[PDB]
Amino acid sequence: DFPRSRLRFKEKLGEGQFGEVHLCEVDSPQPLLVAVKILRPDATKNARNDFLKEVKIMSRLKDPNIIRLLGVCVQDDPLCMITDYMENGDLNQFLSAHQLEDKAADPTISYPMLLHVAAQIASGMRYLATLNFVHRDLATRNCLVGENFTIKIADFGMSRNLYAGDYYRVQGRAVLPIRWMAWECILMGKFTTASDVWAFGVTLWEVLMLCRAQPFGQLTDEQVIENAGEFFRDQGRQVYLSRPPACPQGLYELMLRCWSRESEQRPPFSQLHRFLAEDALNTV
Numbered sequence: 001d002f003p004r005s006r007l008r009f010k011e012k013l014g015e016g017q018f019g020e021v022h023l024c025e026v027d028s029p030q031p032l033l034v035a036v037k038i039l040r041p042d043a044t045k046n047a048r049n050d051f052l053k054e055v056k057i058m059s060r061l062k063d064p065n066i067i068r069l070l071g072v073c074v075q076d077d078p079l080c081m082i083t084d085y086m087e088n089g090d091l092n093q094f095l096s097a098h099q100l101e102d103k104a105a106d107p108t109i110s111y112p113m114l115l116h117v118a119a120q121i122a123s124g125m126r127y128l129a130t131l132n133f134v135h136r137d138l139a140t141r142n143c144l145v146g147e148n149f150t151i152k153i154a155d156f157g158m159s160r161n162l163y164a165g166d167y168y169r170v171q172g173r174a175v176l177p178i179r180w181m182a183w184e185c186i187l188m189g190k191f192t193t194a195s196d197v198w199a200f201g202v203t204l205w206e207v208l209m210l211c212r213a214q215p216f217g218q219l220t221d222e223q224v225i226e227n228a229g230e231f232f233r234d235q236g237r238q239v240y241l242s243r244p245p246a247c248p249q250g251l252y253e254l255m256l257r258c259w260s261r262e263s264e265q266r267p268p269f270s271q272l273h274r275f276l277a278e279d280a281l282n283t284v
């Protein structure tokens with residue numbers, strides 16, 4: 001374990017339902033930067049329980065493209081959770097700050113780098129699928145960026161003010177990221193690896209949009225939920241995200257497969273990874 005006194009708190013990186021995250025320095029790792037989650041100052045008994053369960057969940061996750069648990073604070077110390085610090089933060093904010101490189105002639109990013117970003121996400125999801133672990137909230141806002149466009153999948157919950165518009169809230173119900181959700185999730189509220197594939201399709205759409213636009217952004221929440229009904233009724237009235245400017249038709253057809261009505265017809269993450277890492281390179 002690790003002593004809290006050995007951590008040197010530098011800045012606040014975020015705040016959630018049952019904890020808050022700080023950038024810390026460590027001078028005796030056994031000047032190293034890490035991210036540390038601690039209880040909120042109004043921490044309840046309920047929050048502490050959720051914190052302990054989060055540690056158990058994160059102890060499971062061991063993959064280059066999933067955030068990893070480096071340690072926890074000592075038994076006697078106030079609770080903390082330590083992970084790698086991803087120095088470029090939020091993938092949504094990161095991509096937002098770039099535009100697609102102009103081949104003919106302001107930080108930019110190339111189409112092959114967008115493929116590399118998306119492939120890393122697919123590799124992380126491929127790993128989670130081997131654990132039969134369902135993410136339930138895959139989106140660029142839940143991905144983190146490190147050095148050299150390294151991507152790790154995380155999950156920061158559904159309460160951040162910055163992304164409030166990405167969730168549909170009804171009193172007494174689970175909060176729902178409806179614009180990322182497969183039709184069967186919207187109608188029947190249950191999540192699978194196949195619905196993670198659907199969300200990956202939307203996440204891939206985000207990446208190729210350079211996070212410039214909300215999925216179905218000109219449709220209301222009510223219209224997005226009704227669209228799920230049109231998938232169910234299967235009478236050809238359902239609608240899809242449009243092809244991003246940066247997205248070749250061949251890659252768009254991959255995305256459309258992620259949004260297949262039948263869960264079994266959606267590509268597995270192994271197929272998605274292969275396409276993004278290899279096939280798509282002839283579309284450059």
Ligand SMILES: O=C(N[C@@H]1CNC[C@H]1c1ccccc1)c1ccc(Cl)c(COc2cnc3[nH]ccc3c2)c1
Nearest residue numbers: 013021035036037057083085086089153154155156
């Ligand atoms: O995502 C976490 N927890 C989810 C929720 N439950 C299980 C787990 C999960 C992982 C992966 C997939 C699904 C769920 C989580 C927990 C603690 C900490 Cl400190 C961080 C890292 O925060 C960082 C690291 N670098 C940063 N740079 C700039 C900001 C920033 C924040 C993330």
